[PDB]
């Protein structure tokens, strides 16, 4: 083996870590579809 596989995982290690943001939960089921209908039609 040529030994060229030395830099596996490079960019995913260099990438600065940014934490997720706390956002309020999404509706699910009929309410999500209702909210989706209300913002695409009159």
């Amino acid at each position: 083996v040529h030994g060229s596989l030395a830099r596996a995982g490079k960019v995913r290690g260099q990438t600065p870590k940014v934490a997720k943001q706390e956002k309020k939960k999404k509706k699910t089921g009929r309410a999500k579809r209702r909210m989706q209908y209300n913002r695409r039609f009159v």
């Binding site: 913002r39 695409r40 039609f41 009159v42």
Partner: protein
């Protein structure tokens, strides 16, 4: 109207539904000036920039939270030059960007 629509839906139907214009998509940069006016207009020939007071407000609010232009721009998902142009009285104001700055620094800019 909600009252008339729910009144019509409990009886003989005459309601009309129609799709919105920009419905079901995310336009990342919303346009600030109506192009119907901007294509029509031939006479008026000037754009008002941001006032120096607005740039001072952004400067003081940002500096009072340990925050730089790079960090504020990254926080509101814009390039650093548009922040540096808002603070220096050079950039044409955009209400959407201004609102993002207000929620970033907690002040009122309009």
């Amino acid at each position: 109207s909600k009252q008339a629509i729910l009144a019509a839906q409990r009886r003989g139907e005459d309601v009309e539904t129609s799709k919105k214009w920009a419905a079901g998509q995310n336009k990342q940069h919303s346009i600030t000036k109506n192009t119907a006016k901007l294509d029509r207009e031939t006479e008026e020939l000037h754009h008002d920039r941001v006032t120096l007071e607005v740039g001072k407000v952004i400067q003081q609010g940002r500096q009072s939270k340990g925050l730089t232009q790079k960090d504020l721009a990254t926080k509101i998902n814009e390039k650093p030059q548009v922040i540096a142009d808002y603070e220096s009285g050079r950039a044409i104001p955009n209400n959407q960007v201004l609102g993002k700055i207000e929620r970033a620094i907690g002040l009122k800019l309009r």
